[PDB]
Amino acid sequence: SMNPPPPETSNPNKPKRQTNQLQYLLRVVLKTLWKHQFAWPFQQPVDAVKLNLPDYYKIIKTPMDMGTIKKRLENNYYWNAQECIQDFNTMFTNCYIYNKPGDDIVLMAEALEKLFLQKINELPTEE
Ligand SMILES: Cc1nnc2c(NC(C)C)nc(-c3nc4cnc(N5CCOC[C@@H]5C)cc4n3[C@@H](C)c3ccccc3)cn12
Known part of the structure; x- marks a missing residue:
């Protein structure tokens, strides 16, 4: 069984805005989590074909x-x-x-x- 397309990451029709909370999510939350020793199995979409998990996208x-x-x-x-x-x-x-x-x-x-x-408990207040 094939992999589905990865989730959408960009849409030019969607409105855009810069906020302190979104900046904190990329600069602090995503950065600290990406560097963690256990991050590697969550750094990309599950490749059910390569990992031989044919039931993954039947459940998820x-x-x-x-x-x-x-x-x-x-x-x-x-x-x-x-x-x-x-x-x-x-x-x-x-x-x-x-x-x-x-x-x-x-x-x-x-x-x-x-x-x-x-x-997320240390997320700053909306500016
Ligand atoms: C996200 C997410 N949620 N569930 C899973 C899940 N479930 C399996 C452990 C059944 N596996 C992965 C998952 N993501 C992977 C990314 N890459 C690989 N690799 C195997 C080929 O060589 C190079 C490359 C590094 C294996 C991966 N696996 C499984 C096989 C795995 C195996 C050992 C330790 C942890 C995960 C994500 N998952």
């Missing part, structure tokens, strides 16, 4: 990854900080849905989510 209907989130922030795709936070939440929930609790990949996602929530 709303895929998300940090590579997509990074591209979305770089292309001013998000209007609200909540849209970006929702994508990170979707990425973590997808990992917990597809894999069994206690599996190494789940433990990896749990450590990244713990760091993510701490950085």
Whole structure:
């Protein structure tokens, strides 16, 4: 079974805006998470074909990854900080849905989510 197209990362029809919260999500949240030792399985869309997971896109209907989130922030795709936070939440929930609790990949996602929530707790007020 083939891979689906990756999630949309740029749309010229969508309105664009610069806010302190979106800047914090790219410069602090995405940067700190990308550098983490457990980031590598979440840095790109799941390649179900290469990893031989034919049931991945049969179970996960709303895929998300940090590579997509990074591209979305770089292309001013998000209007609200909540849209970006929702994508990170979707990425973590997808990992917990597809894999069994206690599996190494789940433990990896749990450590990244713990760091993510701490950085979202330090999110600055809207300017
Ligand atoms: C996101 C996300 N949510 N669930 C998964 C998931 N589930 C499997 C562990 C069943 N795997 C990956 C996932 N993303 C990957 C990215 N690259 C590879 N590589 C294998 C080929 O050589 C080079 C390259 C580095 C393997 C990957 N895997 C699995 C195979 C894996 C294996 C060991 C440790 C952690 C993950 C993401 N996932």
